[PDB]
Amino acid sequence: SDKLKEAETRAEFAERSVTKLEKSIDDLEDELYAQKLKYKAISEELDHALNDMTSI
Amino acid sequence: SDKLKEAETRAEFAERSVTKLEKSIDDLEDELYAQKLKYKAISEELDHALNDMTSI
Amino acid sequence: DFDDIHRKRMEKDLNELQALIEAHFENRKKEEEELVSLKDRIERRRAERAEQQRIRNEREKERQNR
Amino acid sequence: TTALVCDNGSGLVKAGFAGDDAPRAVFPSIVGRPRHQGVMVGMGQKDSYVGDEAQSKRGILTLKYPIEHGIITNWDDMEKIWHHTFYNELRVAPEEHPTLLTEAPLNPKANREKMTQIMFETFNVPAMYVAIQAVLSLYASGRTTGIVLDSGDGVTHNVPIYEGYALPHAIMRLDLAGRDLTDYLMKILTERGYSFVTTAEREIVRDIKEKLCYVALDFENEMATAASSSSLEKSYELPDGQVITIGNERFRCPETLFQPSFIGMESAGIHETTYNSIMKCDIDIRKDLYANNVLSGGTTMYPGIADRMQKEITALAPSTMKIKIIAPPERKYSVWIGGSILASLSTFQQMWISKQEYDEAGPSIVHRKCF
Amino acid sequence: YLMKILTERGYSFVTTAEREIVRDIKEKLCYVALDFENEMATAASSSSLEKSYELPDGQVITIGNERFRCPETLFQPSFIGMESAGIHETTYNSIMKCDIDIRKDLYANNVLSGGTTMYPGIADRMQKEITALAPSTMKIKIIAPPERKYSVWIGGSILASLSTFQQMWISKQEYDEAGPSIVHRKCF
Ligand SMILES: Nc1ncnc2c1ncn2[C@@H]1O[C@H](COP(=O)(O)OP(=O)(O)O)[C@@H](O)[C@H]1O
Ligand SMILES: [Mg+2]
């Protein structure tokens, strides 16, 4: 019984850790992807600016 | 016996998974920071350009 | 006619340029340096988390190894 | 009170209160019913998404424009678009605001009469007035003469005006516009392997056309250069990945404007219908029209068109006249800015078609003195 | 298939009652490998994978590389002779049949359900496979709730508890008027 209680508690703690880590990963992923899209957009508008310079 | 075997086994899987998750988290965060720093270097390139544009 | 072209053109010919330059300067100042500093801070915290994870993993592997 | 300067257009509805610089709400004019079945219950699924809402759910809709070439082909959808524009994008009830619609030249009468009948019966406005889309674009430039080429998305028309006196016998209306360029681009993209068929993917091809295409200064030299080097191939990322590379399709899509034989149309390009429109005018106002050629409308926003057109007209015109092409940076909203200016005038305040006048003469009042 | 590959070590289960024992073995021991060839190489050199299990009468058995070979059939249906592609590629094919503008949302909201998706380590193998197949820009996310087994029934309870749904039932008088073929009609 003692071993069972300790094991179950350790398991539950680790499980909740797992869930929270997943949520953190998701949020950081969303922010990083938004930054990535921002970077692609800035580079593309930069190139458009370069081509505008080429025009004039 | 069945219960505690199950619990310890799934807990070990949890520990290995969560450690893999932590490696994933660190790699993602560091890559995010590197990309963000590249972006800020680009922003300061643009800010030097804006200081030139202070010509207007 | 053709006398409002001055009052609708010359205005933004300077005010718009100056205001957009101001906006770019303030946005760059607010954004880039703070983002790089915050990313460095988060990196340091991440390294500390890595050290804590290594210590805990090693001590648990030491005890549990049977 | 303030007047509502609506501008139906064909492709983008632009509206806003009179007296401002830019339209308050600009959104595509598409009404798309859902086409699949739908299994989630209580999701709150409507029967028709209009305006900018149907450009976000376009994956499961069948978008269909209610205005084909200037004329309106589906009156129920157009009524829905107007209702949306008044109530949700401006949030002003029409019972307390005059309206100033715009209409292309040489359009069928029944279209205009039905438009005024709707505005007076359904929305019940106090007074509405219909104006030709080119005179407004001439207002916005601050001129009083000049020949304006208003190449919209539905129809391209070329109205010459001198000293405020329009020349009704010299209006050259051509039905090539942005939509035909979108279809031709969608048709020549198939030469590399990319097939766009669905009415939703027409929007993607339109975005490609807007962001990448440009008008070549000299067509043959560009065709020769794009066939040897690879400095032109610009890539573009679809809404799901799988980037595509556009080669000499870049300047071949908008070249259709100057050679309408590409899409099988017989008529001459926009570079030669302007010269023909000038030559129909009297011999003493041709210099002023040459010097004050005005561009407007969305489709004239291609990078490098104000030079190609000037080169072509200079080739056609006599060598002594000076050819100047006015291309303001606010080209897209030029018609609406002109509409705002016209609605803000005090001299114009008595030209509205008051409701009691409509009650006495019926919808045919629009063709009468109140034009 | 597990009952068929267990015979390679000497354990023969034939009776329809022993299929239940093989099912219990599959539930308690099998797991989906993240990379198949590396696991096949590791299990053939070391012995860190061999997990033992006690039959309903004693005589413990030791499962070697049968652990991750049984559920691998999902991603390579050629093992049991089926022609079709695995569950990692029929999802991508099902996405590609959809319209071009809703593929990003489907990529980001891939949902797993049903009992058989409870193998330890499947939500990572499937994500790796789809990320290999899909374009590099899209984000691939696999929703694997812990209550996977009863997901269908929980959803059924939610649907039956809705007020908007209360008039969609096939009332008995309607069946009496149109016969059993009423189900294909508007009341789906
Ligand atoms: N920046 C741009 N570059 C090239 N083409 C454009 C651009 N913006 C709009 N267009 C084209 O012009 C059309 C919009 O024209 P618009 O002036 O709104 O028509 P309308 O006269 O009906 O308002 C779009 O369909 C698009 O094809
Ligand atoms: Mg227009």
UniProtKB/Swiss-Prot annotation, chains A, B:
Transmembrane segments: none annotated. The modification Phosphotyrosine is found at Y33. Phosphorylated at Ser-55 by DAPK1 in response to oxidative stress and this phosphorylation enhances stress fiber formation in endothelial cells. The modification Phosphoserine is found at S24, S43, S55. Induction: Induced in stimulated quiescent cells. It is found in: Cytoplasm, Cytoskeleton. Belongs to the tropomyosin family. Binds to actin filaments in muscle and non-muscle cells. Plays a central role, in association with the troponin complex, in the calcium dependent regulation of vertebrate striated muscle contraction. Smooth muscle contraction is regulated by interaction with caldesmon. In non-muscle cells is implicated in stabilizing cytoskeleton actin filaments. Homodimer. Heterodimer of an alpha (TPM1, TPM3 or TPM4) and a beta (TPM2) chain. Interacts with HRG (via the HRR domain); the interaction contributes to the antiangiogenic properties of the histidine/proline-rich region (HRR) of HRG. Interacts (via N-terminus) with LMOD2 (via N-terminus) and TMOD1 (via N-terminus). The sequences of cardiac and skeletal muscles are identical. The molecule is in a coiled coil structure that is formed by 2 polypeptide chains. The sequence exhibits a prominent seven-residues periodicity. This is Tropomyosin alpha-1 chain. It comes from Mus musculus. The chain holds residues 229 to 284 of 284 of the full protein.
From Swiss-Prot, chain D:
PROSITE patterns: ACTINS_1, ACTINS_2, ACTINS_ACT_LIKE. Coiled coil: none annotated. InterPro entries: Actin, Actin/actin-like_CS, Actin_CS, ATPase_NBD. GO terms for molecular function: ATP binding; hydrolase activity; microfilament motor activity; myosin binding. Keywords: Acetylation, ATP-binding, Cytoplasm, Cytoskeleton, Hydrolase, Methylation, Muscle protein, Nucleotide-binding, Oxidation. It is an enzyme of class 3 (hydrolase). Gene3D superfamilies: 3.30.420.40, Actin, Chain A, domain 4 (3.90.640.10). The modification Methionine (R)-sulfoxide is found at M40, M43. Oxidation of Met-40 and Met-43 by MICALs (MICAL1, MICAL2 or MICAL3) to form methionine sulfoxide promotes actin filament depolymerization. MICAL1 and MICAL2 produce the (R)-S-oxide form. The (R)-S-oxide form is reverted by MSRB1 and MSRB2, which promotes actin repolymerization. One of its GO terms (cellular component) is synapse. The keyword Protease does not apply. Its EC number is 3.6.4.-. It is found in: Cytoplasm, Cytoskeleton. GO terms for biological process: actin-myosin filament sliding; actomyosin structure organization; cardiac muscle contraction; cardiac muscle tissue morphogenesis; cardiac myofibril assembly; cytoplasmic actin-based contraction involved in cell motility; mesenchyme migration; negative regulation of apoptotic process. The modification N6-methyllysine is found at K80. It catalyses: ATP + H2O = ADP + phosphate + H(+). The modification Tele-methylhistidine is found at H69. Pfam families: Actin. SUPFAM superfamilies: Actin-like ATPase domain (SSF53067). Belongs to the actin family. Actins are highly conserved proteins that are involved in various types of cell motility and are ubiquitously expressed in all eukaryotic cells. Polymerization of globular actin (G-actin) leads to a structural filament (F-actin) in the form of a two-stranded helix. Each actin can bind to 4 others. In vertebrates 3 main groups of actin isoforms, alpha, beta and gamma have been identified. The alpha actins are found in muscle tissues and are a major constituent of the contractile apparatus. The beta and gamma actins coexist in most cell types as components of the cytoskeleton and as mediators of internal cell motility. This is Actin, alpha cardiac muscle 1.
